[PDB]
Design a protein around this ligand. Structure first.
Ligand SMILES: N[C@@H](CC(=O)O)C(=O)O
Ligand SMILES: N[C@@H](CC(=O)O)C(=O)O
Ligand code: NA
Ligand code: NA
Lengths: 295, 295
């Protein structure tokens, strides 16, 4: 049986407030442990990535679910995708409003529809039909995101490997601040915001969404892994190509089917945490990584 | 400088009857003629692919624009995307309504916004801003498509290389008949419905969208070329993979950076056409190709 692992991220970005680092760090910690606790029971890779991401959606320090950034209209529209590495089954939603957990809906699309990707109004209709509570549009909006929008008006994810050796990813976001209405980035798009294949590995992405789409970052990262590269080498190859070809910056987390894993980025920062073998790992800035025992 | 070449497809299909087959011919020659016309006239691969698909969008005989299949509530929902190989510039729309030419709307996304993908409500507001006409949904609904919907309950593309060596793809669709409200297929998804890259080539795909999304069919084809497989070898294996892994059928058109091209499909039939060196290649069933002179 495979030594299970979960990696998590809370979004590529620039410099982060030191005080905020503590809310983010604890955010990372709680999502990774949630993830590892679901795996602990011998739970599935899909379960673990879904659970990890639900936690980060509910945590207002991260741009997904509650605390999602605001579009040009000062409003929240969310993107999500989830993928099962066994049969490449996938679920995705784009442009969804006034709901707690985009990733759960994405999982609802994967499991309770013959499709893989629902959008905007039909995603809203699907949500209702599945008994997803509509939560007030103001409970997702925070004051710090309001001050983010005003200045400009003048993403979370997880990968897992379960005890049976399956891999999965989950990525969730409110997008980029001051985005057009109905803008869809890479997060809900298979191959871009993440990919998962048992014959290679699983990936969740973050960074400049258009650029991530343009280069199909998640799959590319795996193209390099098939071709015999280490998880690190491949991550640097893929992010380096996104920087070199289209001048976009980003980050990613990845676990291979051998359970070798890495977080690597070309944004200034990328909060990440991984749980493997009863230890929790954490980082924000490159070459600055701490490790603690995980009960 | 290179000889220009356009390849169009009219989508994967089951068996095609007598009447439909010849009508398919006419639409395909029109579109290949418009695209090639553009190419012989110093126009871009992007202009060529856009022109071809518009032709097939306007034509009620094809599943895109006028003549789109209807969703679960008798309404036309359309996806389209376009991509330029030079820089990986791209645009796309998903679940758009009440407009004749979603591919034209996809081009504006590329060239007028800083976004690559719009959906539904957002897409409509950007259409209104760009002056795209707002016709009633019914006028895109044909009589044939009314019939198939009541019967179910009980895609078009173009790739071009230009004289300047730019490659592009376009893909447009009405989706699949009786699709859930707001279901999004491969067609507006870079790497799925298509991919253009001046340094490899361009692919446009068709068939069961959910399969195409999962395997990233278009980008997968281009990967094979990158390994040194020829364009037909590339298509054979990428389509081969969609078959074994996700149980998925469809087809593609591919053009290498150097001029080579093919149409391949694992589905029953895929209407297609090509134009290069003053010749028109056309077929629907495997190896039925009529190579004729273009004046
Ligand atoms: N990839 C996200 C941004 C982020 O990762 O923060 C988007 O463009 O939607
Ligand atoms: N791929 C298209 C349908 C097709 O090409 O047959 C879609 O799923 O929307
Ligand atoms: Na959040
Ligand atoms: Na049409």
């Amino acid at each position: 049986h495979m030594n299970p692992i979960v990696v998590v991220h809370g979004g590529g970005a620039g410099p982060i407030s030191k005080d905020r680092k503590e809310r983010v760090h604890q955010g990372m910690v709680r999502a990774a442990t949630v993830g590892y606790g679901i795996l602990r029971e011998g739970g599935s890779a899909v379960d673990a990535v879904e659970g990890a991401v639900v936690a980060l959606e509910d945590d207002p320090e991260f741009n997904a679910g509650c605390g999602s950034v605001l579009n040009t209209n000062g409003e929240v529209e969310m993107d999500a995708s989830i993928m099962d590495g066994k049969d490449l089954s996938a679920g995705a939603v784009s442009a969804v409003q006034c709901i707690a957990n985009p990733i759960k809906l994405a999982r609802l699309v994967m499991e309770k529809t013959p499709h893989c990707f629902l959008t905007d109004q039909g995603a809203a209709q699907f949500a209702a039909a599945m008994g997803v509570p509509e939560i007030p549009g103001e409970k997702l909006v925070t004051e710090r995101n309001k001050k983010r929008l005003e200045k400009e008006k003048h993403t979370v994810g997880a990968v897992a490997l379960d005890c049976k050796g399956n891999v999965a990813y989950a990525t969730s976001t409110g997008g980029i601040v001051n985005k057009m209405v109905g803008r869809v980035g890479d997060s809900p798009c298979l191959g871009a915001g993440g990919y998962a294949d048992n014959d290679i590995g699983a990936v969740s992405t973050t960074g400049h969404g258009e650029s991530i789409l343009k280069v199909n970052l998640a799959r590319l990262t795996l193209f390099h892994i098939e071709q015999g590269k280490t998880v690190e080498e491949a991550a640097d190859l893929s992010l380096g190509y996104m920087k070199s070809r289209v001048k976009g910056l980003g980050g990613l987390i990845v676990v291979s089917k051998t359970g070798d894993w890495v977080a690597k980025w070309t944004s200034t920062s990328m909060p990440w945490a991984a749980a493997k073998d009863g230890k929790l790992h954490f980082g924000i800035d490159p070459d600055d990584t701490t490790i603690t025992d995980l009960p």
